[PDB]
Every structure is written in C-alpha cells, then in structure tokens.
Amino acid sequence: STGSATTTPIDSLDDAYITPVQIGTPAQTLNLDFDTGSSDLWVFSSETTASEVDGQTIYTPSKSTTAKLLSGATWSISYGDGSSSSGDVYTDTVSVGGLTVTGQAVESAKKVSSSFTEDSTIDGLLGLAFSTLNTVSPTQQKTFFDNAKASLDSPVFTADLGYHAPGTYNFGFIDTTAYTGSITYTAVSTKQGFWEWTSTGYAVGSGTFKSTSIDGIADTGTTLLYLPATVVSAYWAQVSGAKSSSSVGGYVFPCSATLPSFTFGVGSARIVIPGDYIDFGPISTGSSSCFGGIQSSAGIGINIFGDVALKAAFVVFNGATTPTLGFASK
Numbered sequence: 612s613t614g615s616a617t618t619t620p621i622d623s624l625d626d627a628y629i630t631p632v633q634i635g636t637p638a639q640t641l642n643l644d645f646d647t648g649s650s651d652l653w654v655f656s657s658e659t660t661a662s663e664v665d666g667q668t669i670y671t672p673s674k675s676t677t678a679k680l681l682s683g684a685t686w687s688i689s690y691g692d693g694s695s696s697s698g699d700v701y702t703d704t705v706s707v708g709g710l711t712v713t714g715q716a717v718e719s720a721k722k723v724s725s726s727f728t729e730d731s732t733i734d735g736l737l738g739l740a741f742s743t744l745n746t747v748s749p750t751q752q753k754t755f756f757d758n759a760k761a762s763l764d765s766p767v768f769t770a771d772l773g774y775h776a777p778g779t780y781n782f783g784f785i786d787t788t789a790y791t792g793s794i795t796y797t798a799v800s801t802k803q804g805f806w807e808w809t810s811t812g813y814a815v816g817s818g819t820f821k822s823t824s825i826d827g828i829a830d831t832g833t834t835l836l837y838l839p840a841t842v843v844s845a846y847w848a849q850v851s852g853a854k855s856s857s858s859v860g861g862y863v864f865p866c867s868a869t870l871p872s873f874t875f876g877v878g879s880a881r882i883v884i885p886g887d888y889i890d891f892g893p894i895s896t897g898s899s900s901c902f903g904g905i906q907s908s909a910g911i912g913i914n915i916f917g918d919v920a921l922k923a924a925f926v927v928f929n930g931a932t933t934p935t936l937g938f939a940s941k
C-alpha cells in the first residue's frame with residue numbers, strides 16, 4: 612500500500628504545516644501537524660476542556676463506531692517550546708492520503724496549553740519519530756508509520772515541504788519526479804528516538820564550504836533551523852544590522868535586508884536554503900525588525916534541522932531495519 616497527502620502552511624510565513632487526517636467511522640477529518648520530532652498522535656477532542664478549545668476541529672470518539680477506549684491509558688507530552696498537552700487514549704481507524712491503519716492509538720486531549728488553544732489552525736499532532744518516544748502509559752503505543760510500515764510497498768515516508776506553498780507527505784514510495792539529481796542517504800542514530808544524523812558542514816551565501824560535523828535531528832515539527840552558535844554567528848555576520856536580541860529571543864535583522872543563502876552538507880552533497888526562506892517577518896506587526904529563520908541551538912542541547920532546512924529538500928525517512936535519511940535538491 613501507499614498514501615499521499617498534501618501538507619499546507621498554516622500562515623503566510625510557513626510557521627507550521629497541516630495535513631488532513633481521517634479518524635474514525637464515519638471519518639472525522641482533522642488537520643494535524645506531522646512531526647518527525649515526536650511520537651504521539653494526539654487530537655483536540657470532545658474531552659478537551661471547553662475553555663481551551665478556540666476554533667479547532669475536534670475528534671468525538673462517541674460518534675465513531677470503530678473507536679474503543681484504551682482502558683487505563685493516559686498520555687502527557689511537553690514540547691521544546693514549553694507547550695504541553697495530556698489526556699486519555701482511544702484506538703480507531705486512521706487514514707492519511709488513502710493509507711489506512713486500523714487500531715491506531717489516537718490520544719485524546721483533556722488539557723492543552725495556551726499556545727495550542729491560541730492556534731486555531733492545528734487540530735493536533737501526528738508524530739513520526741521513533742515509537743520509543745511515545746508517551747502513552749502504562750503501555751507505550753506505536754506511531755502511525757510504525758503501524759503502517761509492514762503494509763507499505765517500501766518502509767519509507769517522504770517530506771516535501773513547500774516554501775510559502777503546499778507540499779506533500781508520501782508513505783510507502785519515493786516519487787522520482789519530485790526532486791532533481793540524486794538522493795544522498797546518510798546514517799541515522801535512533802538512540803535518542805529521533806531521526807538524528809550528522810551534516811558534513813555549511814556555507815554562507817557564496818562563501819567557501821566549511822567541512823565540520825554537525826549532529827542534529829530532521830524535525831518537521833520545528834519551524835526554524837537551530838545550529839551551533841558559531842555557525843549562526845557566521846551567517847548573521849553577513850547581514851548588515853543583524854543582531855542577537857535577548858528581549859526578542861534570538862537573531863533579528865532589518866526587514867529591508869536581502870538575506871544570503873545557507874548551504875548544508877549531506878555527505879558530499881549540498882542542500883541550498885535560499886535567503887528568502889530565512890525571513891520570518893516582523894517581530895511584531897508594523898515593526899521593521901524581522902525574525903531570523905536560523906537561530907542558535909545553544910541551551911536546547913541538540914541541533915534541529917527544522918522546516919527552514921527541510922523545505923529546501925526532498926527528504927526520505929527510510930524506516931528499514933537500519934533506518935537512514937535521504938536528501939535531494941528539488
């Protein structure tokens with residue numbers, strides 16, 4: 612089997628991407644944030660505290676003839692930005708882009724933090740990291756991809772995120788028309804539960820490539836590119852007036868700037884992030900200070916190849932017995 616679904620930016624800045632997911636019988640379609648940095652499929656639901664729901668579409672398990680309470684199971688998650696959610700668990704039928712899993716754990720939120728409530732465009736998360744990170748207790752549950760894997764034509768999924776435009780998540784096949792050149796594959800460590808890999812270096816604009824190992828994670832659920840402070844300083848030094856602002860929480864730059872590209876290495880191959888992908892717009896409405904898309908990972912404890920990086924590539928998440936990642940230009 613295979614599946615293919617379009618993923619759409621939630622706003623004009625690509626602050627996140629949403630993909631429609633069918634849950635239950637009859638189907639209830641929710642728009643979920645596909646997140647290769649976490650491993651829980653959780654949704655706003657009829658159980659979510661009413662004051663914490665503001666415009667999201669909810670899953671109502673009592674209206675699904677295939678939903679079953681997973682007795683005694685609870686979940687609770689915190690994300691890198693300080694947001695959180697928690698609740699109980701059902702199993703139900705879940706379909707993405709025509710690919711169906713029966714008995715998928717659907718984690719129903721009883722509580723969500725303010726950043727979820729305040730974002731009416733995201734109805735939940737669909738985790739695509741390794742199932743070892745799943746938070747369900749006392750019986751850890753499998754991700755949608757792990758449940759689907761054996762049925763897929765090939766044990767892979769691909770992320771093809773758009774810049775200020777829709778893109779595609781495919782399951783079970785590699786669309787050879789969706790990229791240019793060849794796909795370069797690189798080793799993955801699953802020891803922290805992530806799609807963790809080592810980039811071979813970077814370049815800023817037309818500058819020379821610096822060969823240096825940068826360990827980090829391929830994370831579709833993180834908006835920006837978080838890299839070591841040395842690398843990030845080298846990038847923003849090429850932008851007149853750019854500075855790190857403690858009050859704003861990272862590097863900002865004059866909105867009048869034209870930004871240089873940023874290149875990262877995948878083995879001997881190179882992925883070029885165009886400068887415009889690094890512009891996240893005014894820090895507040897009407898400001899001429901703009902927020903940068905490349906930020907320091909210092910204090911986060913891991914480097915994160917988030918959407919800013921991944922949207923410049925066609926990315927293969929190869930879930931073979933020894934997982935690997937593939938990157939192609941597009």
Ligand SMILES: Cc1noc(C)c1CN(C)Cc1cc2n(n1)CCN(c1cc(N)ncn1)C2
Binds near residue numbers: 692831832
């Ligand atoms: C509105 C709005 N505008 O810009 C943003 C961002 C939002 C909030 N909106 C995106 C809501 C939200 C907050 C989170 N998500 N979705 C996804 C899960 N979270 C992660 C995952 C992960 N792998 N890494 C980090 N966090 C935190």
